[PDB]
Amino acid sequence: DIVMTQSPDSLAVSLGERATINCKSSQSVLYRSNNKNYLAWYQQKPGQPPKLLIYWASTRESGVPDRFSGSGSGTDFTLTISSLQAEDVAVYYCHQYYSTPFTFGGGTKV
């Protein structure tokens, strides 16, 4: 199918700085009839089901401050977090929805 490589996996970075998580699947999970990249960024605090962060791999959804930012195209994608806070010790994932079967990321325990 579409096997995804998400890097890095063990982000241990101090507070306040920037950080970036890139994703690289085997397939180029994109579309041109609608120039929308079928791919999403999710995050999860331990103990809860994960939460949606970025849809179309680029666009921001409500309730998301600039502590999250989605971008990417082709088959390379980036989740950039501008500043860190105390509630962001969480696991980040990427997830395709271009074509079944759907896949997730390996995780990123920040």
Binding site: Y31, Y38, Y98, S99, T100
Partner: protein
């Protein structure tokens, strides 16, 4: 010859009646040894057209 000339009696001569042709004794097929099936699954049967 009688059927060619449409007569029950024929006269001394040489007549051309039909055509001779050797017949195929065997049928052979030669195709490449390609083996992998074809990716019709991910063309006809795909989510995003």
């Amino acid at each position: 010859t009688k059927c060619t000339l449409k007569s029950f009696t024929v006269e001394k001569g040489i007549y051309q009646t039909s055509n001779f042709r050797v017949q195929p004794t065997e049928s052979i097929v030669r195709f490449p040894n390609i083996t992998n099936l074809c990716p019709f699954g991910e063309v006809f049967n795909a989510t995003r057209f």
